[PDB]
Subunit: 290 residues, 3 copies
């Protein structure tokens, strides 16, 4: 007989205090219309879910038979092929809904939702797990994505992360931050191996990165004197005079005719003259005369 | 009759091998005193939880009736309105506790705790899920928080993240890292849109950021010659002499009286003289005489 | 009697629509051989798991009795002391497996796996939760690890994160990014408290950081004139001439003999001479003569 001769078997289960396995392939609703959680708890009422302390159920593997909930605040719930577990009372309600790897209507796949309703003053609502399929949106350890084809290939609106970029024969590190908002939504740093150089570029509105990398100056990548508007030492040394003097003496017995660069330095009879000389970078030169 | 005429219904359930729905609104404990997990498993013993392979339960929606556990090592568990599921033996024990959106005593809301006790040499203890309500403490993708009112508004002790800061008419990107410890617990970078400048500031002990932004020098924001203690080229060019010579000839038939800047260059009779001239930035000048 | 006088008690449970508590300490398999999920669902068939809408089970606390699954794509599942819950049909299958704090065969401890098999065209497979024991691999808020003993102690291949490093008497902030791949797999920034300096170093292949920190130049850490290859202003000022003139007059009644630095400037009788003088940094000097 094996209990097949039991009237009101659902009441029996309640009396014995056993968990209610309500259905393995039930169609939750008529069709895949959209339904609210108030309508979901109404449908649970009509099947007697709150008559049992634990009451489970599994939506049929048919998209055209099962509702979808749309007011969770943490993603849609497609009841097609969804496990529904109901714990508590109609007063103090706990539903745990486990979704499968495929859905319709925008349902979150590979998820466990949990619904509490302990009264309207006690914050009713839904929550969703994080898992290896539905990760938390967090900056990843390790490498984000796959290697991109050139150093500028990470788009301004990609996930923040550490990326590898091909530069031909080697590759370079791209450290990308993006917040999807603001006048500057993103910044990227390019880093070459073995302190080979570090650079940044930053975005603008929805226009991406309009400027080329700016290389950051460091003690292994110092500015040049021209970068800062100055001369190098060698450029100063080759232009400006450091000394003036009179050169070797010449004389004549009398007279001394004007000679390019020469000045009279003595009139003993005899006239003495020397060239004016000036020094640039250690080298002396004779002055000339117009 | 519907099994209402069954003595020892709990034993019946065990014999039939069905999961035990023990109560929908039980008060777990006398009051909201603090209790240990040893006391929690003792209370489970006294209700016969380990007599069944699966044994569930749901604490009453009354804070003044239900215990709270405090030794989890992953947050307090308020049993008020908590689902308690017990799986295994008193020897090899697994409890899954699902908490609702509100608690007392510091209970973690919106949580699923799991307790293993397979023997004291086999690492007994608690664990807690991560979910959309109780996220993992991880650097967020996208924007952290809301837009702040000025570029220095992200406090040194805020969560690491990418923030947007109003700068009046536009906004700027603030990249903030904080580890809550050490002589320098935090660093922030300010990044202006379209490579408009990148800056950092870093904190000290619990004192925050005592120095203003330091702008980082780059190939689009190069130091000036004055920044590095040097002259610009134009400043050198306007100060230092590049050439010396004698200017145009004057003569007199005899004599030549001392004249400011002039030197005698010939005594043919006739005396010849020229001015000393020097060159600065291409411009010649006559020397003077004291 | 208490149902002890029931033939085919498993069929009874199915007829009454109650969840099947199949065993509290069953050995799932013969030994700890490796098994596939096809073999796992076959073993579930032979115990009648899919005969019930909810069917639970708990592997015995004996490593030498229970299988381990190895094809999940999200870590091994050691059934020793594992809770197995089976929901749905053999057609539309949902298994939730909860593992304890210790395993063998490489099983993931402290985990909840979920398996869907709704048909081979509907993406069968496994997923695993994230929780306080098995966190998601994400850049951590706050401090990563413990304080390290010197500023270069964070290895190139450690988790990206914010670290604190002892520098003797104080400590410094190390911001580390590592993607485990590429010619430059990692970059670190060192940040000193109160804008005391910011530096980077970057790795190469598997060789780590071969170069010392490069300090980044900023408006509080400007390059020197020598860094950029230039002279300082004081170095220019002390080397190069800014003016030339003739000094005070000397005269003699006649004559004037050649005198170091002196040139004849007048022949009234009487000869007048002055020294050539040049100016460096405001100081005048007398020229000499070879």
């Amino acid at each position: 007989q094996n209990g097949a001769d039991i009237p009101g078997k659902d009441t029996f289960t309640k009396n014995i205090g056993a968990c209610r396995a309500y259905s393995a392939w039930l169609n939750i609703g008529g069709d895949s219309q959209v339904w609210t959680t108030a309508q979901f708890i109404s449908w649970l009422e009509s099947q007697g879910a709150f008559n049992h302390p634990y009451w489970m159920c599994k939506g049929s593997w048919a998209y055209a038979n099962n509702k979808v909930i749309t007011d969770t605040g943490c993603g849609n719930i497609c009841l097609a092929g969804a496990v529904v577990e109901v714990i508590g009372t109609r007063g103090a309600m706990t539903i745990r809904v486990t979704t499968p790897s495929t859905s319709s209507g925008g349902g979150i796949t590979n998820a466990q939702f949990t619904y509490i309703n302990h009264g309207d003053a006690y914050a009713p609502g839904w929550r969703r797990d994080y898992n290896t399929k539905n990760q938390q949106p967090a900056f990843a350890l390790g490498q984000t994505g796959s290697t991109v084809g050139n150093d500028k290939a990470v788009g301004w609106n990609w996930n923040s992360g550490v990326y590898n970029a091909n530069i031909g024969g080697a590759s370079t590190l791209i450290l990308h931050f993006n917040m999807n908002t603001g006048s500057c939504p993103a910044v990227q740093f390019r880093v070459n191996y073995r302190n080979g150089g570090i650079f940044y570029r930053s975005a603008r509105d929805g226009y991406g990165f309009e400027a080329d990398w700016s290389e950051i100056y460091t003690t292994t990548r110092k500015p040049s004197a021209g970068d800062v508007g100055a001369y190098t030492q060698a450029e100063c040394n080759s232009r400006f005079i450091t000394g003036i003097r009179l050169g070797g003496l010449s004389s004549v017995q009398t007279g001394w005719s004007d000679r390019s660069g020469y000045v009279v330095t003595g009139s003993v009879d005899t006239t003495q003259a020397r060239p004016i000389q000036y020094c640039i970078n250690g080298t002396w030169y004779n002055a000339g005369s117009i």
